[PDB]
Ligand binder design. Structure first.
Ligand SMILES: O=C(O)CCCCCNC(=O)Cc1cc([N+](=O)O)c(O)c([N+](=O)O)c1
Length: 236
């Protein structure tokens, strides 16, 4: 059974500078295992995502050393050893399940005591389209070798969590769609302009959301770098 695969995280945690924080990530299918190749990502205001950990335990370059990831017993764990005020954020884990990624629901971390990037993924800020129509979203990679990375697409509906849409390999053309989005999204890419595209079809008000692109590749820190997100509003 994996058609109901659900990833669970703590609702909220509170810390302060110099404390240790433990965040966990559990799978409904059994123990979290090495094959789940877990990523941890951080959401700051407004819709600003950064990948912290990939491949269960690999810290992304540039991420502070106080962040570490591991598989401990049957869960994935992100530890912040010596929290800082800038760590106040929502933390999501993501698990690989055979042919799709599943995000956990996120943990809101509060830190008491409050008070350019080489790689860039470039998305337009906003789009509006009518119900029943389709729309094109774009994501241009800058400052890295675009064909050497897959492009993931992810959405966040208002007030809610992350949902994986699919990914495309620019080098081979291979596409994966999540079952949730295989009739909603269509992925294409253009290598000479380093641009990934996603067409969203048969729009409805449920499709009003922020849509992100993010990098990945086999064995890489999936979701290391993210576009800023395009806000789509579906309205007459
Ligand atoms: O221990 C070590 O480093 C050696 C083992 C490295 C395992 C790396 N796994 C992934 O990168 C996860 C993943 C695999 C895929 N696959 O295998 O087809 C995908 O297609 C896919 N995706 O996003 O679509 C994602």
């Amino acid at each position: 059974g994996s058609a109901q695969a659900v990833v669970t995280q703590e609702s909220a945690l509170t810390t302060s500078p110099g404390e240790t924080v433990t965040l966990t990530c559990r799978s409904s299918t059994g123990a979290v295992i090495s094959s789940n190749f877990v990523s941890w990502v951080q959401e700051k205001p407004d819709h600003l995502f950064t990948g912290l950990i990939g491949g269960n335990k690999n810290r992304a370059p540039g991420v502070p050393a106080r962040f570490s990831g591991s598989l401990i017993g049957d869960k994935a764990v992100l530890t912040i050893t010596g929290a800082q005020t800038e760590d106040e954020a929502i933390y999501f884990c993501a698990l690989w399940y055979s042919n799709h990624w599943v995000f956990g629901g996120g943990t809101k971390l509060t830190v008491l005591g409050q008070g350019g990037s080489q790689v860039q993924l470039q998305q337009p800020g906003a789009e509006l389209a009518k119900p029943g129509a389709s729309v094109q979203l774009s994501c241009k990679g800058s400052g890295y070798t675009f064909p050497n990375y897959w492009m993931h697409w992810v959405t966040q509906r208002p007030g809610r969590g992350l949902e994986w849409i699919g990914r495309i390999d620019p080098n081979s053309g291979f596409i994966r769609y999540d079952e949730r989005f295989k009739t909603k999204a269509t992925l294409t890419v253009d290598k000479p302009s380093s641009t990934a595209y996603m067409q969203l079809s048969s729009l409805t008000s449920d499709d009003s959301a922020v849509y992100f692109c993010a990098r990945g590749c086999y064995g890489c820190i999936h979701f290391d770098y993210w576009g800023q997100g395009t806000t789509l509003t579906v309205s007459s």
